[PDB]
Design an enzyme around this catalytic site. Structure first.
Site, PDB file in Angstrom:
ATOM      1  N   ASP A 110      40.930  35.584  36.852  1.00 56.90           N
ATOM      2  CA  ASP A 110      41.830  35.944  36.407  1.00 56.90           C
ATOM      3  C   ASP A 110      42.936  35.546  37.238  1.00 56.90           C
ATOM      4  O   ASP A 110      44.270  35.676  36.769  1.00 56.90           O
ATOM      5  CB  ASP A 110      41.165  37.236  37.414  1.00 56.90           C
ATOM      6  CG  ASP A 110      40.886  38.264  36.044  1.00 56.90           C
ATOM      7  OD1 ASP A 110      41.137  38.206  35.125  1.00 56.90           O
ATOM      8  OD2 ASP A 110      39.696  39.363  37.276  1.00 56.90           O
TER       9      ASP A 110
HETATM   10  O1  LIG Z   1      43.454  39.103  42.408  1.00 61.27           O
HETATM   11  C1  LIG Z   1      41.900  40.538  42.461  1.00 61.27           C
HETATM   12  O2  LIG Z   1      41.476  41.473  42.051  1.00 61.27           O
HETATM   13  C2  LIG Z   1      41.020  40.291  42.148  1.00 61.27           C
HETATM   14  O3  LIG Z   1      40.262  38.623  42.832  1.00 61.27           O
HETATM   15  C3  LIG Z   1      39.854  40.720  41.175  1.00 61.27           C
HETATM   16  O4  LIG Z   1      40.751  39.409  40.057  1.00 61.27           O
HETATM   17  C4  LIG Z   1      38.198  40.036  41.067  1.00 61.27           C
HETATM   18  O5  LIG Z   1      37.547  39.994  39.663  1.00 61.27           O
HETATM   19  C5  LIG Z   1      36.529  39.455  39.209  1.00 61.27           C
HETATM   20  O6  LIG Z   1      37.333  38.652  38.986  1.00 61.27           O
HETATM   21  C6  LIG Z   1      36.159  37.462  38.755  1.00 61.27           C
HETATM   22  C7  LIG Z   1      36.999  36.080  38.446  1.00 61.27           C
HETATM   23  O7  LIG Z   1      38.489  36.008  38.773  1.00 61.27           O
HETATM   24  C8  LIG Z   1      36.427  37.608  36.832  1.00 61.27           C
HETATM   25  O8  LIG Z   1      36.382  36.488  35.970  1.00 61.27           O
HETATM   26  C9  LIG Z   1      35.640  39.248  36.648  1.00 61.27           C
HETATM   27  O9  LIG Z   1      35.872  39.155  35.021  1.00 61.27           O
HETATM   28  C10 LIG Z   1      36.706  39.949  37.148  1.00 61.27           C
HETATM   29  O10 LIG Z   1      36.030  41.320  37.687  1.00 61.27           O
HETATM   30  C11 LIG Z   1      37.486  41.141  41.702  1.00 61.27           C
HETATM   31  O11 LIG Z   1      36.105  40.774  41.915  1.00 61.27           O
HETATM   32  C12 LIG Z   1      36.858  42.558  41.559  1.00 61.27           C
HETATM   33  O12 LIG Z   1      36.848  42.818  42.957  1.00 61.27           O
END
Ligand SMILES: O=C(O)[C@H](O)[C@@H](O)[C@H](O[C@@H]1O[C@H](CO)[C@@H](O)[C@H](O)[C@H]1O)[C@H](O)CO
Ligand SMILES: O=C(O)[C@H](O)[C@@H](O)[C@H](O[C@@H]1O[C@H](CO)[C@@H](O)[C@H](O)[C@H]1O)[C@H](O)CO
Ligand SMILES: [Cl-]
Ligand SMILES: [Cl-]
Lengths: 785, 785
Positions: B472
């Site tokens: 993300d």
């Molecule tokens: O900077 C940020 O907000 C956080 O790191 C979010 O990207 C993250 O969100 C996850 O991050 C994964 C890897 O990037 C992604 O594949 C999933 O779809 C997303 O739910 C968290 O696990 C939410 O709790």
């Protein structure tokens, strides 16, 4: 106990429990800090937008402080733990977090510093905070003295919790090279544009020592352990563990171990603040962290505060009033105009009102403020909801929600500037507009503002309110485009009448006629549609309902339409006594006049958000001091001298003990409000908001200078027009005016039927001192019947 | 101590200090709560958007929980104080806020409840929390027993702090009619549209008692007084003061006074939660607050959890694995697909992956999820970044920042659904698109998704990354419109190869050829531009730089391009061993495989925000379990059975004591991450994020069902293909599949050269059970070499 000390320089509270919300403030060109008497603090700085370096233990909202802000054990603060190494007994300065029994406690609000003296276990502690004028850093000086007859072995621990800095990245460690603790984060965001925007953020927090310590701890949880803040585990043990923070909440804790001889005192210096990098922290260290650096900063800061001391010193029969006026009022006024509340987009009504206060302190600042504000006027004549102070800044929060009153403040506050300075020549300065190529004089811009106010009225001749006027959260009266404001109408009549008087002084006779006629037209509309029989209503909703009337159970009367009808001429001589009586009956309280009553207890959705506030808080029925002083000013305008003074004096807490305990504030500022809803909720009535940000004080200072002491400028010189309370047999004031000084003595005489004025012992005719030479001092004697 | 109890229903920790961050969770259709072992809790509910009823003591940001969330003394929680009226001695359950010495402590994570037993002062306390299935309310049951031989006079005080609800309006008082405390606020806002939007908010918080109390206190500061939470003043005195909150922070405190006989136990019931008004609070009271109401809710909730028990029960030589798989894994999987993480706009990759897990639990939910997701596909074929679950909802937060990978998940997760269910007939269902009038079959929508992935590639044949892919916060590789993703390329080859296999099963031969050719083209591009000699790079920036390569000091290797090259065919047989070895050397740790290494320690602005996270946290180099299980799945795909199992087993903490203490978690869920950066920061490596929201678990469940135990569906029936670790001499599983039950016994034999399968004691030929009758049970014996 609670009293002025040090010849007025400070104000001392001697209980850490009697007034536990009490606080004082400091500011500089780039930051402010509110310090609570028990050691909690809230600090904000500009870079150039607001930020902080000491965080809550959770992910807090973007905000500074709330009214009546509550504290809790982990709230940010500024603490020092003392440990008797022989007994294991501990205490903390100033009082939190341990809340030990103390043998002595003083909290000293200062004009230029904040300090404490405490004693426990035979050890005497002093703590002093100050700020420099131009850099963001806190200067902390700690003194520890063995007050007993034998040597004492102590551990001394600064505890400056950094808090939860960021969920993306937070850490901290000790840096020998910086000489202290450096906590570090990355401010969270998601949008790529924000990475560019955030590049120069000072996302490190430093806590640097002058004297190297025995040990340190940077991990908050390691500091507390099971013992918590009451009895930290790190302090139970012999030496701190020297831990760091790796995606853990960081903290700033040092340890000094000392054996102090009988009567021996030692001094320790620290600085605390934000930095881009260690290099900037070291730059601050080199500039500030020494006895010489602290003394240079203190001397420069005291100079800055003295530069803002203002134009009036008083000696009345009321020594609490004297203290407040002489020592505390001018600094609060000065803060407002000098740094504009530390926002890059001041609300236009705030910018113009706070700069009005500056007319009595540093009027060249006022002058430039009008030039700056008018450069941002729209080509229509309308003023924007805020004024931008930095290229690239934007309108934020309430300033994006359309309010309609912005132009009214221009002539209302310009009048104070012109009266004090006689700088009519400002009116000739040429300034642009917000868009377009037109460059016009100040005077032309002002005419276009008043034409805007005249155009922004409905078919009845009443001012549109949109999503609010002076009452920021009064957002549902006119949001559909039809509702109008009772207050804005009466105040527009005032503005137009003042500006027509300026036009007449400037030989702009057509303008004078045009705006005088405007003002009569509005006043007639007000009398036809807004007057409710015993007081003026507050507005007419989009669906045609008049509110702030005798048929309304809540919000039956509002203060503002009454004061402003008095000033603008909607209230004639027969309606004036109805207003005074209705205000007394429904709005006056022992803590000051409420802005509306009874307070709203539920949403009324053709008035709006204001009605959702707790009854008695903020615009919903508090003693909202800014509305109160508009009334006081209206009272002075009609010679209601006793009622004016009574209500003004109510703004100052004390000396009555019950009053001081119930408002809960040190008498070193006037807050934005004291709690209202006096009839509905007596228990809490009077409680101070503790918010030192308020436009009240420019107006309170003007009322005292020009109205109560009656030393007001005109194009001929100094007009002597006092409205002293009758209880005063004698009074004195020292007035600085147009470069000269007037030592004024006021005395009541039963030999005279009318005021008599003497200048240097000769009776004058009339009420004006006309021959004023810069640098001279005059003795004025005013005998009153 | 730390162990499973109650025949697997619960999991018990017996120290409140050894694992102080440990926690368990509950959810229902509308809320979730994370409960810490010492009594802190975080609770969110949907109305239909997220909100809370128990607040911090300050103005908190809009958020649920952070990874590795720290607590502090005033954090929200769920407490009961016990006072010996003879001695004045006090303690609190569960442990906070007093942190007294206890004679006994148990924290019990349950499948359907959370509970504690504690004892101090001879008094035995039980506390049990559960939720109903469909309403937002906490059901609290407290039991107090005198365990000694003489009568004991006690005061018992629930303490459920409401916190700082709002700066606009907050209050609270006791309501005899509701039978408890009602705190009330108005959620702050400024825009008129938000008043309309906020109308149905449940801005009251109730704390209701079944048994009327002796007294109560609603003002937080009055409760604490100087004594604080350690020794509240209100508890020091004989009776609570019965105070209210009038624009003061409210709280929920009751008092019961009891003289309990020897061995006497009493039960007290409460409910806690949000309400629109007192009427709704009373509706909840009537429905729930009784022994009958608690029992009905509990029975209905246990039924809901059993409905989600899944399809696999195991009996292996590893009893920790058995416990986790049998009792904890399926509930965590179930939560994800049943309530979609309590967001009204799930991230599309999360929606599709969590629903994939549901294929093993309640596949009709999976089926409808594909129908719903595809109805929102764009006419181009692209999928949106989120899927809306309620009319009027909007894309929020990361879902407004353009990521490119959304379509890849469709065939990757559809394959699990089709294999488990054989519901190829889904492909014939007709659904619309997000815009336009076109209604097409599922199959056609899938073809358009795969055509989208093929079109969204540069001239080199590599997938554009825009502002991110699966990672993300990987937002600066392609934000200028040229950068491409190494991972997205390899995964698109996988997706296309799977979907071509479906097309071939469906006689869609042209499609099969087209996507097979697509996949080869991408793989060839990957080998030409992304392969770095010993592993696949991660992406090529807008300026043409390949990163995740041996020339990079930080972020030298990423896990994802390796796993996905294995699955999609970019990694041939000669490159596979290079990948395995590089992962082992650089990414494997005792706590699991890291997603990249070494972690970034500063911004690298042609990769982006991910590089700003603390090294070892979240995407920056943690043991990010979701990436780890993609690797495990890739390992199973090539028969690397031992390496697959080893890395999967690493996801479960324990039984090693040092491991359990260092990760700090109860073994009742798999968190989104365990801290990485193992080489850079050993002290913290392994620490659990404590976040039970994670797409990991759908994939872990699939790997165990289809890969380790090897009981996988096909169009012919049940395929037996186990990859057991060699250490297991014997194992058993019970597999539910297409309505039938398979009791599988696995046994190693040195008499055979190749696996032998018996069905009801007859040897079969091949590896497929083809004759499956719904409702039947089969005995399967699998002998392995
Ligand atoms: O900077 C940020 O907000 C956080 O790191 C979010 O990207 C993250 O969100 C996850 O991050 C994964 C890897 O990037 C992604 O594949 C999933 O779809 C997303 O739910 C968290 O696990 C939410 O709790
Ligand atoms: O709902 C809100 O945010 C707050 O009540 C603000 O409107 C208020 O802001 C003041 O409210 C006054 C009366 O409405 C207004 O005249 C001043 O220009 C504005 O500074 C506060 O004093 C800011 O501290
Ligand atoms: Cl008003
Ligand atoms: Cl990745």
């Amino acid at each position: 106990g609670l009293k002025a000390i040090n010849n007025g320089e400070r104000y001392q509270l001697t209980s850490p429990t009697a007034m536990p919300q009490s606080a004082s403030f400091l500011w500089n060109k780039k930051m402010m800090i509110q310090v609570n008497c028990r050691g909690y603090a809230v600090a904000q700085f500009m870079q150039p937008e607001p930020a902080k370096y000491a965080y809550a233990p959770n992910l807090e909202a973007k905000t500074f402080m709330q009214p009546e802000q509550p504290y809790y054990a982990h709230h940010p603060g500024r603490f020092f733990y003392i440990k008797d190494e022989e007994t294991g007994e501990i205490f903390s300065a100033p009082y939190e977090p341990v809340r030990s029994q103390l043998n002595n406690f003083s909290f000293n609000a200062g004009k230029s510093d904040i300090s404490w003296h405490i004693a426990a276990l035979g050890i005497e502690v002093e703590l002093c905070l100050s700020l420099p004028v131009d850099d963001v850093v806190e200067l902390w000086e700690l003194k520890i003295k063995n007050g007993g007859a034998q040597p004492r072995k102590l551990s001394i621990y600064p505890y400056f919790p950094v808090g939860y800095m960021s969920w993306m990245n937070q850490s901290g460690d000790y840096s020998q090279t910086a000489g202290g603790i450096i906590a570090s984060c990355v401010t969270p965001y998601q949008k790529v544009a924000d990475y560019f925007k955030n590049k120069d953020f000072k996302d490190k927090t430093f806590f640097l020592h002058e004297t190297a310590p025995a040990a340190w701890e940077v991990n908050q949880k390691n500091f507390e352990g099971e013992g918590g803040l009451h009895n930290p585990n790190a302090i139970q043990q012999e030496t701190l563990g020297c831990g760091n923070a790796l995606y853990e909440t960081p903290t700033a804790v040092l340890q000094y171990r000392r054996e102090l001889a009988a009567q021996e005192q030692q001094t320790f210096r620290f600085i605390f603040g934000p930095a881009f990098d260690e290099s900037e922290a070291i730059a601050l260290r080199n500039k500030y962290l020494s006895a010489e650096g602290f003394a240079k900063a203190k001397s420069e800061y005291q100079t800055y505060i003295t530069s803002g001391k203002g134009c009036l010193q008083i000696n009345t029969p009321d020594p609490e009033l004297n203290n407040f006026v002489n020592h505390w009022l001018p600094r609060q006024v000065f803060y407002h105009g000098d740094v504009n509340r530390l926002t890059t987009d001041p609300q236009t009504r705030n910018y113009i009102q706070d700069n009005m206060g500056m007319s009595y302190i540093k009027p060249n600042i006022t002058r430039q403020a009008f030039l700056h504000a008018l450069s941002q006027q729209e080509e229509s004549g309308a003023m924007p909801d805020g004024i931008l102070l930095l290229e690239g800044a934007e309108l934020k929060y309430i300033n994006q929600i359309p309010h309609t009153d912005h132009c009214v403040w221009l002539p209302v506050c310009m009048q104070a500037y012109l009266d004090e300075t006689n700088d009519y020549a400002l009116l000739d300065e040429i300034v642009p507009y917000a868009s377009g190529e037109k460059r016009e004089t100040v005077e032309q811009h002002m005419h276009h503002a008043m034409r805007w106010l005249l155009q922004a009225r409905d078919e009845r001749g009443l001012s549109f309110i949109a999503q609010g006027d002076w009452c920021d959260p009064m957002n549902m009266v006119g949001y559909k485009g039809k509702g109008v404001s009772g207050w804005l109408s009466v105040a527009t009549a005032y503005a137009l009448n003042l500006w027509a008087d300026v036009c007449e002084q400037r030989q702009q006779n057509s303008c004078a006629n045009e705006f005088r006629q405007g003002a009569k037209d509005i006043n007639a509309a007000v009398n036809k549609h807004i007057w409710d029989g015993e007081w003026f209503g507050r507005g007419i909703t989009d669906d045609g309902v008049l509110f702030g009337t005798s048929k309304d159970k809540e919000g039956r009367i509002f203060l503002n339409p009454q004061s402003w009808a008095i000033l603008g001429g909607a209230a004639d001589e027969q309606k004036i006594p109805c207003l005074l009586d209705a205000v007394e009956q429904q709005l006056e309280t022992p803590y000051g006049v409420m802005m509306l009553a009874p307070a709203f207890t539920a949403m009324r959705d053709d008035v709006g958000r204001v009605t959702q506030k707790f009854p008695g808080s903020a615009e919903n029925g508090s003693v909202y001091n800014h509305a109160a002083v508009f009334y006081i000013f209206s009272l002075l305008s009609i010679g209601e001298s006793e009622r004016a003074y009574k209500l003004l004096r109510q703004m100052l807490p004390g000396p009555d003990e019950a009053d001081l305990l119930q408002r809960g504030q040190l008498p070193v500022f006037i807050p934005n409000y004291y709690r209202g809803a006096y009839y509905q909720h007596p228990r809490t009535a009077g409680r101070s908001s503790q918010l030192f940000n308020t436009g009240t004080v420019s107006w309170v200072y003007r009322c005292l200078i020009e109205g109560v002491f009656g030393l007001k400028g005109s194009p001929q010189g100094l007009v002597v027009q006092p409205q002293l309370p009758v209880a005063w047999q004698t009074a004195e004031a020292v007035r600085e005016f147009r470069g000269a000084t007037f030592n004024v003595s006021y005395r009541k005489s039963s030999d005279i039927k009318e005021m008599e004025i003497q200048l240097n012992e000769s009776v004058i005719s009339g009420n004006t001192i006309s021959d004023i030479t810069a640098g001279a001092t005059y003795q004025l004697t005013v005998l009153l019947p």
